[PDB]
Amino acid sequence: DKRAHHNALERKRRDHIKDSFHSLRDSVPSLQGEKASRAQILDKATEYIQYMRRKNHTHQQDIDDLKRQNALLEQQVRALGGC
Amino acid sequence: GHMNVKRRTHNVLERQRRNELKRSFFALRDQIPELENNEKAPKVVILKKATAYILSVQAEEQKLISEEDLLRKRREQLKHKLEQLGGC
DNA sequence: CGAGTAGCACGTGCTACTC
DNA sequence: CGAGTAGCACGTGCTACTC
């Protein structure tokens, strides 16, 4: 009685994990529309997260530089005109 | 007999496979800020949160690209202004 | 031994694909 | 060739949490 029920609950639990793997797979560019085992999905997700965190960090790095540039230019435009 | 050897091989190879999969789960968990002090996070929570985190990083890139593009156009504008004003 | 059940991990089942 | 392997599904029993 409780045996068949427990078995159904466990199957349902595994199914949710299956759906979650699919949603994860859909999030990594290299796995989209591709075939991969669960081990590959976890491994590629991990490498992609490291890669992205170093990619955005570089993005912010280029942004702050432009930030320092525009601030200086703003200084010049200020101290310039029809003196 | 062979059937018994095959059974034992299956058990040992699958056990090892589980172990390696757990390794992969832990490695991924370690890359999610939100799971910093939650080493016991169940498999499904690691999946859902890794997914949430990835989506945030991508959207986060789309914002950074939009900002850099704006800062660049801004820079050339400032320079264009300097040229119009001339020196003192 | 309180009942219900999420999570886990083992042994085993299942089968497409390989050599 | 037809047996071996890969990789995911299943049944099950035990813990811990929550009511």
User: What approach was used to elucidate this structure?
Assistant: X-ray
DSSP B34-83: GGTT-TT--HHHHHHHHHHHHHHHHHHHHHHHHHHHHHHHHHHHHHHHHH
Chain A residue whose CA is closest to B53: A49
- Rounded to a whole number of angstroms, the distance from the CA of B23 to the nearest CA of chain A is 9
- Residue B53, both tokens: 């985190």
B43 touches A17 (CB < 8 A):
yes
| Residue reference for tokens 């994990």 | A17
| A50 vs B: CB within 8 A | yes
Contact A31, A44 (CB under 8 A): yes
How far apart CA B22 and CA A35 sit, in angstroms, is 21
Task: Inspect the interface and report whether the beta carbons of A59 and B61 lie closer than 8 Å.
Answer: yes
A81 touching B (Cβ < 8 Å): yes
Rounded distance, CA B78 to CA A62, Å? 18
DSSP type of residue A28: S
How many separate domains does chain B show?
1
> Could you say which DSSP state residue A75 is in?
H
Complete domains list, chain A, with CATH:
1-83 (4.10.280.10)
Long-range contacts of A54-59 (CB under 8 A, 24+ apart): A55/B61, A56/B57, A56/B60, A56/B61, A56/B64, A59/B61, A59/B64, A59/B65, A59/B68
Which CATH number covers residue B40? Answer: 4.10.280.10
The residue segments making up the domain with residue B88 are 1-88
**Using N-to-C axis directions, what is the helix angle for B43-85 and A2-25, rounded to 10°?**
20
Inter-residue contact A42 to B21 (CB < 8 Å): yes
